[PDB]
Design a protein that fits this description.
Distance between the termini of chain A: 33 Å
Structural class of chain A: alpha/beta
Distance between the termini of chain B: 19 Å
Largest sheet of chain A: 7 strands, mixed
Bound molecules: S-adenosylmethionine
Structural class of chain B: alpha+beta
Organism (chain B): Homo sapiens
GO cellular component, one term (chain B): tRNA (m2G10) methyltransferase complex
Subcellular location (chain B): Nucleus, Nucleoplasm; Cytoplasm, Perinuclear region
Keywords (chain B): Cytoplasm, Nucleus, Phosphoprotein, rRNA processing
Protein name (chain B): Multifunctional methyltransferase subunit TRM112-like protein
Number of strands of chain A: 9
Oligomer: heterodimer
Strand content of chain A: 25-35%
Shape of chain A: globular
């Protein structure tokens, strides 16, 4: 009953994206090749999806949540600030016929300690935007670590790897660079890089001390 | 919104008060291994009051002795925690009294 990388990637290509994306919210979806590789690794290498309660922070239209549910999560909960994004996700959840999914509209930066150590795994492709000197991906990362009991899987810029590792030592949590991914933003996007790929991201696995 | 989700949202003390105008039954494949590992994690007061408000009957008062081996308890808990979805309703913050709408199964916690 197991799913190979190519099969999962082909199924994630059926996930409908942002209809009218919001530029200030960084509404770009995780590409099926990026998402499949990421999820396949979480389940096959670390076994952090099957019979787990997973949280998807900034779930958008659901790419990472739909794949997590398909890999055997007991429950996958997606969190997003935008209603329009969750309506597409809710539609994808109905169409894929996935019954192990839930959704919450909220600000991940303004989350309550009501969900402290309430999830087994937290997965995310967070926004990178600067919000009062702090990058959103790091504000999402501190929330994720407070919520996850076992692991956090996140995408952070490779250029800023030094700051992520420095914060892991400060937070006294384990860190592991799983992969170095290189994807471009949707071709629809107006301001692409001309000397390189748009996003040079690191797939990172954060874990806790025993 | 499932009752397991309500429980995660309320966890830590007063839980979010659930009220519903539309509740539906959604079959989820029975996974006994997942349900049994959720039982020690359930905040039972939050769960009992939420299930009571949704007008659900024969709700277990807490874990049974040797629940890991009791399929009927695990099927009951599977049903109550995963298959009873509030479609339209509210989540109320106990301390402020503020209402958060649940529409199309999605709670809006955003102020
Ligand atoms: C990079 S996209 C993630 C796309 C999603 N993982 C997918 O594959 O479709 C970032 C997402 O974070 C959401 N977002 C932005 N700021 C947020 C915040 N303060 N709290 C929660 N979600 C937020 C955006 O609405 C967007 O859906």
């Amino acid at each position: 009953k197991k799913v190979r990388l190519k099969e999962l990637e082909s199924r994630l290509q059926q996930v409908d994206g942002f209809e009218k994306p919001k530029l200030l919210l960084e509404q770009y979806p995780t590409r099926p090749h990026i998402a499949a590789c990421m999820l396949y690794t979480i389940h096959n290498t670390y076994d952090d999806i099957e019979n787990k309660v997973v949280a998807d922070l900034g779930c958008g239209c659901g790419v990472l949540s739909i794949g997590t549910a398909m890999l055997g999560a007991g429950l996958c909960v997606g969190f997003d600030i935008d209603e329009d994004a969750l309506e597409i996700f809710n539609r994808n959840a109905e169409e894929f016929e996935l019954t192990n999914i839930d959704m919450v509209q909220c600000d991940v930066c303004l989350l309550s300690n009501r969900m402290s150590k309430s999830f087994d795994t937290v997965i995310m492709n967070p926004p990178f935007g600067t919000k009062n000197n702090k990058g959103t991906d790091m504000a999402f990362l501190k929330t994720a670590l407070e919520m996850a009991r076992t692991a956090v899987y996140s995408l952070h810029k490779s250029s800023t790897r030094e700051h992520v590792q420095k914060k892991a030592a400060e937070w006294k949590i384990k860190i592991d660079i799983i992969a170095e991914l290189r994807y471009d933003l949707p071709a629809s996007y107006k301001f692409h890089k001309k000397k390189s790929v748009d996003i040079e991201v690191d797939l990172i696995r954060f874990s806790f001390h025993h | 919104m499932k009752l397991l989700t309500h429980n995660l949202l309320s966890s830590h003390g007063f839980p979010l008060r659930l009220q519903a105008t539309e509740v539906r039954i959604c079959p989820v494949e029975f996974n006994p291994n997942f349900v049994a590992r959720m039982i020690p994690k359930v905040e039972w007061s939050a769960f009992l009051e939420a299930a009571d408000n949704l007008r659900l009957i024969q709700v277990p008062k807490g874990p049974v002795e040797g629940y890991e081996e009791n399929e009927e308890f695990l099927r009951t808990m599977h049903h109550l925690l995963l298959e009873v979805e509030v479609i339209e309703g509210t989540l109320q913050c106990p301390e402020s009294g503020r209402m958060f709408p649940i529409s199309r199964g999605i709670p809006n916690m955003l102020l």
